[PDB]
Amino acid sequence: YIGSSTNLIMVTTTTLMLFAGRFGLAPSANRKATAGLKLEARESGLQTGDPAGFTLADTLACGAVGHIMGVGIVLGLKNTGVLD
């Protein structure tokens, strides 16, 4: 049952934020969004592999909110059935 509706919605949501958290469309651990814009990047010291500063704590946040926006859309199931 991999590839049903509830799956494609999940994989897009999670990857979109991980893209967003690493490429520049979200505040990661190394970018803080102020009262206005997002580009207020700083250092935090989480020595890792990803050259973009994407750490072990940012592969979890964007993964976490990857599912929070993944459940609200899927459980908007007034037009995709009630039981899968």
């Binding site: 990661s28 651990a29 989480l46 750490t55 940012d58 899927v74 039981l83 899968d84």
Partner: protein, 742 residues
């Protein structure tokens, strides 16, 4: 960053100071000058602020002190579970909960006091309790004396754990300051760990234990044959025989087919007709919904990694034109002062306790709590008093902060500054309202009473005369009655049964709830509460603002937090210390609350509670007289004090005798307090002298010279007794009355 640096062995565990009373304070340690010494020993025992001058030690003492407070509660819990196991008819109560009183105290028969062992039925005897543990132990599916015993041991163990923990963290390894001040992680754990995981774990126990078991008892089975709660958690097929959604296991939870658990996770609303309580499916769902919300909220404030907010920066963006610098600087003054936090926490925890008491009588959460008139009245009354006091405490410690910790050269705040600068406006405007409400709330009662006395019952304010209908409450009642239709399509019924529509819920010939009407007689009393609340706010608020200076005394701050007076000059300056403002507030807190718990008691007996006919007609306890007799002050004397004190007064010779004595005994203490409030010290000091002389004659003059109580102690003892006499009198008035009539 955020780490755990503590110390090793700050203060050495030893018994020396246990034999040097008053070691903590430099003044008290020199010895007992006079009997004034043995009063100042307790008055400054816990004032850790006055002992030392740095925040680190004050912190470690309050941190360890809480462990003691935490430990006692566990010991208190342990007794309650133990007592319910060894000295109760609980297991009998589980058979016919409708008509067997909960009893969990049994007295030794020494001096005839075995008459107190009442015939609570169920083949047992003893003091009929009213704290309502039994509905709590049934809602958790206990159904055994053995299980009440083991938790009692488990509760007792934690008490030793906490008490040990307190010792360890003050004498062996005490935390440092930097540990304490890291308040981002503080909030972060409490939201996710304590509040969050607390519900989710509990939502666990309801799903696997309380729900399927109570579904047997409600279905109707003897308690002895209900398979033990670890049978469901092992034999998964048993849960199938009630709840088929438990066949698939936890995989729907992982495939977002959440509508499969609809058997035991619902959104019903209303109350359960069988047991008169909420539907345990909703309660099961409720803690689960709460769990997620708290847990996510836990992940907000930045602790050690990149993500998260800064509590300092949140307070430093909201600054407005009218307000100026806004909430800048509040981070400090809420971090380097315990009296700020204690004042702020007290108000919220004080307020929440009240909202608890408004909900637990309208959405009865435990089974067979609705038809327990002894419990409903007590639980509602209890948390009102607890809620009332804690709010008053928030005024005292806010006042203490203004005197001791506030300082406009370093911990400067702008909002707290602007609030000080126009304090004359704040009190005067609050003064006018308290007068406006005073005339238009009490006066309407007085005018009603005068017109009724003169034979003009067509000029009174009532439903049958000049009318005052609360429409705004009647409108909002209407909205919640039709909410299940449109504005909340999921809900089967309204969130309660007191909304202005629906139908009653009858349990064993006793009304659970029914729609509560709101006519004119309710309109007046709601504007009484708005009056006493405002006046109580006025006294406490004046104390907080004027705790440092006023147009009378320009240097009141220099005189401390609780000083008696500044002498009889300038016309007389008795009672200008902030401590004497809270001293005055206590009476009004005692005044506001008392009318609330009077309003609740009469309204429910007259309009809600009462038996129910088999035919279907309902007869309330007092015959529905609240709507006509509560509008005249004499009405509150005839039909409430005089007519509902019958049960307490003639309670001699039966198990309700102990209330008959306390009723009197609480009058004596109340009238006793007046000797301290009315009189003054200088008279009692002199009479003491003459008494002291006679002892010189017989050589029995003590060496701790007798003294009269200090000025602010004469008041402190005066208010304390007055409150104790007033509250206890109502206590004996309520329990004995309601226990006899239902």
């Amino acid at each position: 960053e955020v780490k755990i640096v503590v110390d090793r062995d700050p203060v050495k565990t030893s018994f020396e100071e246990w034999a040097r009373p008053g070691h903590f304070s430099r003044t008290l340690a020199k010895g007992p000058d006079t009997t004034t010494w043995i009063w100042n020993l307790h008055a400054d025992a816990h004032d850790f602020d006055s002992h030392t001058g740095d925040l680190e030690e004050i912190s470690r003492k309050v941190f360890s002190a809480h462990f003691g407070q935490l430990s006692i509660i566990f010991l208190w819990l342990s007794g309650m579970y133990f007592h319910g196991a060894r000295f109760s008819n609980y297991e009998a109560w589980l058979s016919d909960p409708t008509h067997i009183g909960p009893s969990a105290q049994v007295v030794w028969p020494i001096v005839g006091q075995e008459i107190l062992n009442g015939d609570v039925g169920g083949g047992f005897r003893g003091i009929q309790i009213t704290s309502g543990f039994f509905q709590l132990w049934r809602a958790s599916g206990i159904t055994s004396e053995l299980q009440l015993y083991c938790t009692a041991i488990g509760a007792l163990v934690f008490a030793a754990l906490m008490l040990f923990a307190g010792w360890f963290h003050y004498h062996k390894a005490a935390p440092k300051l930097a540990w304490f001040q890291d308040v981002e992680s503080m909030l972060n754990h409490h939201l996710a760990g304590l509040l969050g995981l607390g519900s989710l774990s509990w939502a666990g126990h309801q799903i696997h234990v309380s729900l399927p078991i109570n579904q047997f008892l409600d279905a109707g089975v003897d308690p002895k044959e209900i398979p033990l709660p670890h049978e469901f958690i092992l034999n998964r097929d048993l849960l199938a025989q009630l709840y088929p959604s438990f066949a698939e296991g936890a995989t729907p939870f992982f495939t977002l087919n959440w509508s499969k658990y609809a058997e035991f996770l619902t959104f019903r609303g209303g109350l359960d007709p069988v047991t008169g309580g909420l539907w345990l499916t909703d309660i099961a769902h409720h803690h689960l919904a709460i769990a997620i919300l708290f847990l996510i909220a836990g992940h907000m404030y930045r602790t050690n990694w990149g993500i998260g907010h800064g509590l300092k920066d949140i307070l430093e963006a909201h600054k407005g034109p009218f307000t100026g610098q806004g909430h800048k600087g509040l981070y400090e003054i809420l971090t380097t002062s315990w009296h700020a936090q204690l004042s702020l926490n007290l108000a919220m925890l004080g307020s929440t306790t009240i909202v608890v008491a408004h909900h637990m009588y309208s959405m009865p959460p435990y089974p067979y709590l609705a038809t327990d008139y002894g419990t409903q009245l007590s639980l509602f009354t209890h948390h009102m008093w607890i809620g009332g006091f804690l709010i008053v405490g928030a005024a005292a410690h806010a006042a203490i902060f203004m005197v001791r910790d506030y300082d406009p050269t370093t911990r400067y705040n702008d909002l707290l500054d602007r609030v000080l600068r126009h304090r004359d406006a704040i009190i005067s405007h609050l003064n006018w309202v308290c007068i406006f409400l005073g005339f238009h709330s009490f006066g309407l009662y007085i005018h009603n009473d005068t017109m009724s006395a003169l034979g003009r019952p067509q000029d009174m304010f009532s439903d049958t005369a000049i009318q005052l209908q609360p429409i705004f409450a009647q409108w909002v009642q209407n909205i919640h009655a039709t909410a299940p239709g449109v504005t909340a399509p999921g809900a089967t019924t309204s969130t309660s049964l007191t909304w202005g529509g629906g139908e009653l819920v009858a349990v064993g010939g006793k009304v659970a709830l029914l729609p509560i009407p709101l006519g004119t007689a309710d309109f007046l009393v709601h504007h009484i509460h708005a009056f006493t609340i405002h006046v109580t706010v006025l006294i406490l608020l004046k104390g907080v603002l004027f705790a440092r200076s006023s147009r009378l005394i320009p240097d009141k701050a220099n005189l401390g937090f609780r000083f008696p007076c500044d002498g009889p000059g300038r016309g007389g300056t008795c009672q200008v210390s902030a401590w004497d403002h809270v001293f005055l507030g206590l009476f009004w807190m005692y005044n506001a609350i008392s009318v609330v718990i009077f309003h609740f008691s009469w309204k429910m007996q007259s309009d809600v509670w009462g038996t129910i006919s088999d035919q279907g007609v309902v007869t309330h306890i007092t015959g529905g007289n609240f709507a006509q007799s509560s509008i005249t002050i004499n009405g509150w004397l005839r039909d409430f004090l005089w007519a509902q004190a019958s049960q307490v007064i003639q309670s001699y010779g039966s198990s309700l005798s102990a209330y008959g004595l306390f009723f009197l005994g609480a009058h004596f203490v109340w009238a006793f307090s007046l000797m301290f409030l009315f009189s003054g010290r200088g008279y009692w000091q002199e009479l003491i002298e003459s008494i002291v002389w006679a002892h010189n004659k017989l050589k029995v003059a003590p060496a701790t010279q007798p003294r009269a109580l200090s000025i602010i102690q004469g008041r402190a003892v005066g208010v304390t007794h007055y409150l104790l006499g007033g509250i206890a009198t109502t206590w004996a008035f309520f329990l004995a009355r309601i226990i006899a009539v239902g």
